[PDB]
Amino acid sequence: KIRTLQGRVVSDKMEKSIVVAIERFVKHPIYGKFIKRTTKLHVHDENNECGIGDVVEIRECRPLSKTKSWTLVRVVEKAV
Amino acid sequence: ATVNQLVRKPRARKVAKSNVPALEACPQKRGVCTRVYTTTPKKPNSALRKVCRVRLTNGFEVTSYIGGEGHNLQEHSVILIRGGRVKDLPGVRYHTVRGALDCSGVKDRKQARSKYGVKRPKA
Amino acid sequence: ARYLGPKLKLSRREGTDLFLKSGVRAIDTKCKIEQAPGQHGARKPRLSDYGVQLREKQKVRRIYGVLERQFRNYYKEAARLKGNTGENLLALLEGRLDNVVYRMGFGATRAEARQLVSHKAIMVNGRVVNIASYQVSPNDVVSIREKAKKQSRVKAALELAEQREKPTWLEVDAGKMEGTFKRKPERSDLSADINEHLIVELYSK
Amino acid sequence: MVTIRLARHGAKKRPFYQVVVADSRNARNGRFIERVGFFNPIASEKEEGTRLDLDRIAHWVGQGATISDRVAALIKEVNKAA
Amino acid sequence: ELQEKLIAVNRVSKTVKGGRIFSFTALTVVGDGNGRVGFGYGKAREVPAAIQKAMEKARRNMINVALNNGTLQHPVKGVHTGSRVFMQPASEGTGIIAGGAMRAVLEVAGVHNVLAKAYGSTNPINVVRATIDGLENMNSPEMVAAKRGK
Amino acid sequence: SMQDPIADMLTRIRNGQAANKAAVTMPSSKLKVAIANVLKEEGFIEDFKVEGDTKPELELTLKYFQGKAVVESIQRVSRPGLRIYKRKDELPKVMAGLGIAVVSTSKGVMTDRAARQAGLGGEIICYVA
RNA sequence: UAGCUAGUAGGUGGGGUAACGGCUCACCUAGGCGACGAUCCCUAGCUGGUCUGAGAGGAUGACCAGCCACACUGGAACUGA
RNA sequence: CCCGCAGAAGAAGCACCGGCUAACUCCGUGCCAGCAGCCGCGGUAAUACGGAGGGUGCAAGCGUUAAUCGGAAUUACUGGGCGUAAAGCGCACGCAGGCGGUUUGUUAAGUCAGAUGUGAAAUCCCCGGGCUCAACCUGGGAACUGCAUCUGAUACUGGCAA
Ligand SMILES: [Mg+2]
Ligand SMILES: [Mg+2]
Ligand SMILES: [Mg+2]
Ligand SMILES: [Mg+2]
Ligand SMILES: [Mg+2]
Ligand SMILES: [Mg+2]
Ligand SMILES: [Mg+2]
Ligand SMILES: [Mg+2]
Ligand SMILES: [Mg+2]
Ligand SMILES: [Mg+2]
Ligand SMILES: [Mg+2]
Ligand SMILES: [Mg+2]
Ligand SMILES: [Mg+2]
Ligand SMILES: [Mg+2]
Ligand SMILES: [Mg+2]
Ligand SMILES: [Mg+2]
DSSP: OOOOBOOBOOBOOSTTOEEEEEEEEEEOTTTOOEEEEEEEEEEEOTTOOOOTTOEEEEEEEEEEETTEEEEEEEEEOOOO | OOHHHHHHSOOOOOOOOOSOOSSTTOSEEEEEEEEOOEEOOOTTOOOOEEEEEEEETTSOEEEEEOOSSOOOOOTTOEEEEEEOOOTTSTTOOEEEOTTSTTOOOOTTOOTTTTTTTOOOOOO | OOOOSOSHHHHHHHTSOOOSSOSSOOSOOSSOOSSOSSSSTTSOOOOOHHHHHHHHHHHHHHHHTOOHHHHHHHHHHHHHSSSOHHHHHHHHHHHBTTHHHHTTTSSSSHHHHHHHHHTTOOBSSSSBOOOTTOBOOTTOOOBOOSSSOSOTTHHHHHHHTTTSOOOSSEEEOSSSOOEEEOSOOOTTSSOSSOOHHHHHHTTTO | OEEEEEEEOOOTTSOOEEEEEEETTSOTTSOOSEEEEEEOTTOOSSSOOOOOOHHHHHHHHHHTOEEOSHHHHHHTTSOSOO | OOOEEEEEEEEEEOOBTTBOOEEEEEEEEEEOSSSOEEEEOOEESSHHHHHHHHHHHHHSSEEOOOOBTTBOSSOEEEEETTEEEEEEOOOOSSOOBSOTTTHHHHHHHTOOSOEEEEEEOOOHHHHHHHTHHHHHHOOOSSHHHHHSOO | OTTOHHHHHHHHHHHHHHTTOSEEEEEOOHHHHHHHHHHHHTTSSSOEEEOOSSSOEEEEEOOOSSSSOSOOOEEEOSOTTSOOBOOGGGOOOTTBTBSEEEEEETTEEEOHHHHHHTTOOOEEEEEEO
């Protein structure tokens, strides 16, 4: 792996059109407090397998669609 | 107060209303003399202060002060004006560059001639 | 660029001899020094801290015959350079050629010493340097051009040059009219009656 | 093709060239790939006047760069080994 | 090393049947140049009467200050009424830069190379004072070990 | 609300001290302790004491040197509202060096003199002098 | 300005490009975005850096260099690496 | 760049001087004429108007206007306030959000460490070098406080468990 991403599912309800949330804490560049800056990513997963609430590991590939540059790698946990 | 608070809504710095729309930050502006009044000053003072309402190159009509002792400026004279209020004459926020365009310099001035626009007298 | 105006007037206002008529007579008088720099000079200048702080740097300035712009830049250089800002300032002020010409006696007063410089009548390590502010560094070697040597001025110049306390940081002939800036003058050389820290303050705020 | 040439970072009447490797199509004093020497043609006889990292110039030429006319001269004027 | 200076002199009015009766006030500082500084106030119907009356007050009402060379050990904050002040050791560049007013107490008190600044009201009576107290509270660069050690 | 105990410690001290109070107690915790440690080991308190089991009770003995209290000032620095973290090179020094700053690191709660020597850094819990 | 979105979001296949790709098409899924501020409106070329400030900041983007974009306005392609 | 030639010969102005602010007098004028960055000056002795003598400041510039930041801790992150001065919503309940007692395990995102790559040159800064000095030019460092990857550390924070 040249890097990977974790993040929780959020939306499984679409023919491989899976979208994953990614949560980082970051120091406010001005008032020093740490806040949650979220990222959403449109990730491919052939034969639809993850489910809303799943933690998942993810890698950056080429464009699979005007929107998708990431396929999944593994699953982690379920039935949140 | 709160950190959160500043986070949501940052400290904002009040912007500076100018005291002299010589439009767009301009060293001075050209204009034409609408009227050549002379009115009287505020509270403590008492006088007959020369002025002139001036249609500026940029459309603004503005009342401007005429500095010095004595001046030949009438309606239709083309002048140059600079920043410079006159507290005494509320409403007046610009001066007129003596010895510019059709504005004459002050007759006979010896001291401080460059203000009031007077040539170095043939000494 | 040069002051050019009646020059005793200065000392009188500064209240001290700035050595600008330097030449013959000493301990002025035969002038008027002090009690009337103008028409109200008779009067006591009970003056602000700003005033005393002003006249000090003014004094130093009227002395080396330097105008504001350059002086400011001296000060800035001083401050840049490590060491006591005020001392460095004084150092720089001495490193001036014109000064290290009057200081080797080749000229009655610094003004005269300078006329020499600008009149291509000096040579550092061999070569002619006619610009009054040429900074002179240790081991340098400032001579009088053969052309116009032992000519008028330069004689009496080198003369009462010995009447003066007479340097230390510089060793100097008198026959050849050459001489060697041996080292940068220390605080303790020169001074007493000049108060850097003030003219550091003037330029601090 | 890439080339080794003189940029003129001098100063009216007292030139001082940088010698650079760059896309031959760019401006004389423009975007370049890497610097590789310099050339003060008012060097004065005192000391320095034409330093020139040869082993790089070597690399690029090896990779197909062309050289100027003047630079070429400097390399065969630096002598090369001594 | 007597060393003294006055900081501010001021007029004030009293107001009685017959009008305003005026008077002057003096604010002074005296130090030895080796720690020990004091300020005095003292007012009086005329100027010299007041400045004198002050210098005296300042001779007593003198505190001492645990310097460290020509400077301060740690940076210190001082604050009295509307005046809130702050000064810093400053591995002396040259040093002694502050608002002529607390330069005064600094200078005489013997500190040789600080940078300082006054916030809040520049009112002399309260800055030169916020500064005295400022140096006062400042604690010994070792009698902190006295403090601890144990 | 309880929300920030560590300030409450720093404070129960600051206060009792100003109340020339001999001792002072409070609910304990892994963390309170590690700091009470540095506080004693740096000689700002006499000695601590945790007397309980299900409902532990930190207890600190205060000090007074001259007439004064020994702790001349104790402030939070990090806090729930706003966490502070410094890298090693960017660690702070109180009163120029006198007095100290408690910093928690991946190798435990230690002083600034300490963490500095340990070549690392962490969350700067509080200042003390 | 609080909702925005039909090639819209994804899939499958055909076509397409030097190239991945809703790039395009046909068909299917009903999705995609959004108060961590979408949509709408106003203003604006970005940077290295420039001035100021003890710093943190504030302000700014001539002259030098890097990137983008434009070539009377709008729209087009041809030739060609 | 160098040498000769003549003769001080061709070469000084601008603003200011009531306080802040370095620099004071006389004459005119008389709430007029006028000044004025702020305060405020002018109705008979005006250091504040205008002129003169004198002075102070700058100098081939000097003043005026315009413009940015500074002083302004006057949007206060560093670094502020809301009883009476500007400022607590008339009161409560509560979604999102923020924050959250105490223990052990685990996680390693925040946090911290190291390593590597990258952070264009110029500019800034430090030490030098070259133009009679300087501005200007230039060698070499230093700096670019940043970003990413890898591996580590687990006290604090976040997650999971009980
Ligand atoms: Mg000049
Ligand atoms: Mg396809
Ligand atoms: Mg500041
Ligand atoms: Mg077109
Ligand atoms: Mg083609
Ligand atoms: Mg005065
Ligand atoms: Mg005037
Ligand atoms: Mg009169
Ligand atoms: Mg500010
Ligand atoms: Mg306030
Ligand atoms: Mg109120
Ligand atoms: Mg209420
Ligand atoms: Mg806890
Ligand atoms: Mg660079
Ligand atoms: Mg040189
Ligand atoms: Mg935990």
